[PDB]
Amino acid sequence: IGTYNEEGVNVDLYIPRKCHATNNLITSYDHSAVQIAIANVDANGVLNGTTTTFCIAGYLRRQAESDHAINHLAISKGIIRIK
Amino acid sequence: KIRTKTVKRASKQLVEKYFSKLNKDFYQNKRVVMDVTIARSKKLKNKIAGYTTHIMKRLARGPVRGISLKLQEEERERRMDYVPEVSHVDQAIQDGVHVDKQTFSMLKRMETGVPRHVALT
Amino acid sequence: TMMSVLANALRCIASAERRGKRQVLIRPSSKVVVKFLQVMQKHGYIGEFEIIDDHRAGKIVVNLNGRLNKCGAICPRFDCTTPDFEKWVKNILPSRQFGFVVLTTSLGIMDHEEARARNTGGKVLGFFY
Amino acid sequence: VESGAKVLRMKEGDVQKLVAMHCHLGTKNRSNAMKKYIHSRTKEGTNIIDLHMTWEKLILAARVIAAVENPQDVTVCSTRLFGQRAIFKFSQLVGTSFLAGRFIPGTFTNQIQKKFMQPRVLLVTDPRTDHQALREASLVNIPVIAFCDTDAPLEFVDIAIPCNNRGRYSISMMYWLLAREVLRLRGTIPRSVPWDVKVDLFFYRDP
Amino acid sequence: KEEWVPCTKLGRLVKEQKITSLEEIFLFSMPIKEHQIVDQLIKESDMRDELMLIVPVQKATSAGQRTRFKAFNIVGDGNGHIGVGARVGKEVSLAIRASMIAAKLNVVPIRRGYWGNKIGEPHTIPMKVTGKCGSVSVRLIPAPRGAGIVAAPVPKKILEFAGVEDVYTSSCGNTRTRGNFIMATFYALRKTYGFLTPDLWAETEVSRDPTDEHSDFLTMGSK
RNA sequence: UGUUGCUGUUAAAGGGUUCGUAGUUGAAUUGAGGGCCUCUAAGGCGCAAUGGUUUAGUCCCAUCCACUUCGGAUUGGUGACCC
Structure with missing residues (x-):
């Protein structure tokens, strides 16, 4: 990940986050891009401490693509189950 | 006449932090206020205490608006009580549930099916 | 009317990849459109696709990733030679790193790197980033 | 669940409640946001909301609220009288903070102020009253959970739970459920027994 | 300098050594609203300021005009930080200050x-x-x-x-x-x-925001 | 002065409308082969077979509670699933 030399030494200041909805990038001047955390659960119905995470981005939220995103991600993990 | 915002502001703070009054007497209220506050005007003390009374009278009815949610709390603590015993979700089911067509349809196709005490009009 | 079939594909694909769509429909079809996608699909710009039959003129469908930024056609289909390429790469592409220009050469439809390697020139076709 | 234990899935009692108290009865009106969650309608044109997908969203919501390190990074917002009790009551069980009454712009975006808050989660109750709050969460990176009807704008609402919100009963029952299923997962009020607090605490009572 | 007392979750975490660079900030894309956070995490004698522009501005009123100065200030570092900001004042030295402050809240990598x-x-x-x-x-x-x-x-x-x-x-x-x-x-x-x-x-694998990680601290601070 | 590379709602500029010759431009189609031999070759949601003791979970049996809202057991069946 990121730019290298021919010595393999990484020269990027930092490597930014993805959007997992649309595979974009999450800029420092965008304040509308967020991170949600859904706690994983064992048998009996208790918490084991969080695993799964989503990332959504600026572009989506103001066009109201939000809900549609979070469905189409959660279904892929098996968090949400379609009847 | 019209009361300045010094008056109003002050008075609100008291109604909040004390329910060592609830009285609709100007008189009773006043003698609380003057030993709780330092303002060094006797004029101000009159107007403050007067307004106080005209908050407590409103408080005995619906929402006063713009004076915390503590009102709900001490209003709930009264009588009675609260109101049963077994209720409400109990009564509701047990006396029949009635429902229109579309709902009943959708329910019986679920993996829990149409449950006990439901339902047709 | 409908003139260029090719640019009626690559304009659709481009726009849709902005607008957040994960699939596109492309209503006319050609023996050109197919090939142009096959290229891209190697690298990872295009994920899969289908080709539907109607027995008059086909339809096509496209999948998407997010790894494509823009694609298009360079309409009059100008000419290029073995030194010439560096003109086009300095122009249409933003850099001499990650872009590609697409050409129709004597050998077949290819992308600029491949061209230079095998030492053919040829006409030009489109680009993708 | 992952390696399914077949808890957190509807049982008889669940259905019974949600039918009775009219949480499946929506508005006549529609919007392109809500058309997935709509399921048929009547001759009144009253849209009827799916039970199954309400429940799924509802579960998901709880798993957010009880992920949090400290409950006080959740806020619960409403403006409407019928809900303005059940805010309080919900918050008092779970341990969350809340914001009641009209929403003051300058409570999330103002640097230095009497009321300044920075919650990591949010809840509205309608996005069509609470609108102002949504706006301010755009700029502070706050994800928003919302109850909805068969209308609702979803702009700056990450998670949408279709509900009714048109009467005392409707708002109450949703908060009652959420309080239950957060406690079950975290700090173990058990799900062997029925829960012991009764609904009517949450219910609005007229003056 | 007159002292800093932080009013932000971010600001607390910076004012003790938890967040030790601006790239942690930049990642999770949190806003910076206290100029002292840029002062803290960037070493001194490595910031380069200067004023691009100072300029008059008027408005019309009864009797005459009204005058307000204005200024642009740019700030950053050769490792890949820069920002810009412009502000207004009714005196000169005012607008100067207010620019510089502004500029240090629009830092971007x-x-x-x-x-x-x-x-x-x-x-x-x-x-x-x-x-x-x-x-x-x-x-x-x-x-x-x-x-x-x-x-x-x-x-x-x-x-x-x-x-x-x-x-x-x-x-x-x-x-x-x-x-x-x-x-x-x-x-x-x-x-x-x-x-x-x-x-x-x-x-890439994603990570929790500093707030989550260090949450221990921020709870004690509330009390 | 704009081939690369401009502008034309209101800053200078779409000609009142239509037909129409020279000129410029113009849809799809004959079609891209397999076989065999290996290499840690990346995958099969295809299949036989041994291993699961709550040492995975879920169906179908058993039994007692139970009007919403109970769980112990027969590696139940290598239905299913890891490995």
């Missing part, structure tokens, strides 16, 4: 790459970009080693402070309005992390 063979350290932007503010627009173009900054006076400062060496440039619009010229060139630089290249994509 800047990405650099190569034109050709990958040797040494990056001296040039990885790609072409654009910015537009007003009519006036600006375009930044990669260039090879030793090509140097070929630009007008106004842009050349922006670039030099960023840590971009070799470049080229070009503009359209009225370039003689200086406030818009500045802001254009700034918006240009920003978009080098706004564009997605084969250098990256890999779907």
